[PDB]
């Protein structure tokens, strides 16, 4: 039972910053790929960003230059720093642990930005 | 993906281990006797990859 812990969201005024975290535990076969996805009520899963074991970072055009992903090799965890927040980012975000077979999916943290 | 329990009996004792073994399709113990004694039988464990 590979388990993913996501934390660090909530309500933040426009222009604020937050840092969400996913800890992947269990099997998580070494050549894994951890990604972040967006879903606002009424829309689909929007690919926010992706990082592989190669250390390469891939970001979408929606949040150009605003969101960053950081890796922790010792615990094999991931933290996205979401800064310069805009009301268009009001959506629940989820983790995509590609692993090497049984793709895992997240539990969710609410991200709200409005004034 | 899941925890597994492993019992083996070699010529000397029992090995009971509870870990996350990556079992292959055909686990086994390769047995060979020594060239002079043949009283005991040496085992090479080919049960799990990791």
Experimental method: cryo-EM
A65 backbone φψ class: left, alpha, beta (φ>0; ψ -120 to 50): left
Q: Are A91 and A9 in contact (CB under 8 A)?
A: no
Q: Is B32 exposed, middle or buried (0-12, 13-18, 19+ CB in 10 A)?
A: exposed
Gap between the Cα atoms of A80 and A19, Å rounded: 6
Is B3 an 8 Å CB contact of chain A? no
Query: Cβ of B50: how many Cβ atoms within 10 Å?
Result: 7
**HSE value, Cβ hemisphere, 13 Å, CA-based, for B44:** 4
Q: Which residues contact B4 (CB under 8 A, 6 or more apart)?
A: B18, B19, B20, B21, B23
Q: Return the residue of A nearest to B20 by Cα.
A: A27
Interface test with B, best of A3, A24, A27, A28 (most B CBs within 10 A): A27
Gap between the Cα atoms of A110 and A11, Å rounded: 8
Token readout for B10 is 């070699």
For residue B1, list chain A residues with Cβ-Cβ distance below 8 A: 1-2, 26-27, 102
Q: Are B8 and B23 in contact (CB under 8 A)?
A: no
Cα–Cα distance list, A91 to A3, A11, A50, A55, A95 (Å): 22, 11, 17, 26, 13
| Tokens 């910053």 found at | A17
Cβ density class A48-57: b for 16+ within 10 Å, e for less: bbbbeeeeee
Does A1 contact B20 at a Cβ distance shorter than 8 Å?
no
Q: Are A4 and A24 in contact (CB under 8 A)?
A: yes
Q: Cα angle at A48 between A45 and A54, to 5 degrees?
A: 125
For residue B50, list chain A residues with Cβ-Cβ distance below 8 A: none
Q: What's this structure's resolution in Å?
A: 2.5
Cβ density class B10-28: b for 16+ within 10 Å, e for less: eeeeeeeeeeebeeeeeee
Gap between the Cα atoms of A48 and B37, Å rounded: 67
Gap between the Cα atoms of A63 and A18, Å rounded: 14
Token readout for A30 is 């070494």
Is B49 an 8 Å CB contact of chain A? no
Query: Cβ of A89: how many Cβ atoms within 10 Å?
Result: 22
Cα–Cα distance list, B33 to A31, A75, B40, B41 (Å): 40, 45, 7, 5
| Residue closest to A93 by CA, chosen among A54, A48, A32 | A48
Is B42 an 8 Å CB contact of chain A? no
């Amino acid at each position: 039972q590979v388990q993913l812990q996501e934390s660090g969201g909530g309500l933040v005024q426009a222009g604020g910053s937050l840092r969400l975290s996913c800890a992947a535990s269990g099997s998580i076969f070494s050549p894994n790929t951890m990604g972040w996805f967006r879903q606002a009520l009424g829309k689909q899963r929007e690919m926010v960003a992706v990082i592989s074991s190669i250390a390469s970072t891939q970001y979408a055009n929606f949040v150009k230059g605003r969101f960053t992903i950081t890796r922790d090799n010792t615990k094999n965890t991931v933290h996205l720093q979401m800064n310069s927040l805009i009301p268009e980012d009001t959506a629940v975000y989820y983790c995509y642990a590609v692993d090497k077979s049984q793709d895992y999916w997240g539990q969710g943290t609410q991200v709200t930005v409005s004034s | 993906k899941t925890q597994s329990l492993l019992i083996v009996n070699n010529a000397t004792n029992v090995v009971i281990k509870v870990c996350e073994f990556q079992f292959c399709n055909d686990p086994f113990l390769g047995v060979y006797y020594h060239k002079n004694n043949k009283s005991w039988m040496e085992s090479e464990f080919r049960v799990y990859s990791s």
